[PDB]
């Protein structure tokens, strides 16, 4: 019944909104320049940089160290809305960290598009916007960390997906099932399927002049499955080349043997 997938897609939206503080809507408002929202401070180079410390360990580690905790705050937001996907946290409790532990960066990324655009990305929960050249022109491996981000989002946000819809996409990336690991396979599958009408639905009929968008948004999982796995090499090369920085142990758990 599409009735009972409405409100699996109601309720998935709603425990979007309660776990994730910067919704692509709130995100929106502020590139846009929407007067629901106020403007950010762009960084665009060292001084303005400077500045923002103010306003909101060389550079390129400063940056990359924020990046890191902000990603932290973005796995326990994703965790948190994990929780209340209907069935997962009555699933094996080592399925559950399994699911996440994959789940978890294809799923801030593809949350994380919301906050770029092609121009760069808004940071300090929209109160900052770092431009993508500034990143870019970071020195040599941290430089090119967030260019791979920037592109899929580009090509992501193209798709002009809402929070609603993206409540459910991302719940369809946690309960994979194809995960490495899975002890139990078929109940996730399970949750999956229902997900995956859930998000079927709520194209058709968020986006009804919008062919395929469920087929093509299904596609865009595998530019996150690429992104994820280019990502975990360059934390390997930094880890190499500076011996004094530290990668958070909850990020750290996360790409243990991928
Ligand atoms: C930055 C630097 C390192 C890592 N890492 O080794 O996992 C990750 C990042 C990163 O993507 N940080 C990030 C993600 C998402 C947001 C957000 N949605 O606001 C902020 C920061
Ligand atoms: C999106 C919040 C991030 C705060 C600034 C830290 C830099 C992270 C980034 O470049 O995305």
Known sequence: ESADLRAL??????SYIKSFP???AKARAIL???????SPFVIYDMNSLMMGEDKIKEVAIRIFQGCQFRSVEAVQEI????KSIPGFVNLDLNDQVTLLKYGVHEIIYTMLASLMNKDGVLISEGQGFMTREFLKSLR???????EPKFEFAVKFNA???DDSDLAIFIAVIILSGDRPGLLNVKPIEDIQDN??????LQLKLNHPES??????????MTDLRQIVTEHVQLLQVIKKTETDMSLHPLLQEIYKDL
Not at 195 to 200: I, Y
């Open 211 to 220: 062919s395929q968008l469920f087929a093509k948004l299904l596609q865009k």
């Open 9 to 14: 897609a109601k309720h998935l939206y709603d």
């Open 22 to 24: 910067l919704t692509k």
């Open 79 to 82: 965790t948190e809305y994990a």
């Open 32 to 38: 846009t320049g929407k007067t629901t929202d106020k």
């Open 140 to 146: 040599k491996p941290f430089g090119d960390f967030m």
């Open 195 to 200: 997900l995956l009408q859930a998000l079927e």
């Open 159 to 161: 798709l002009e997906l």
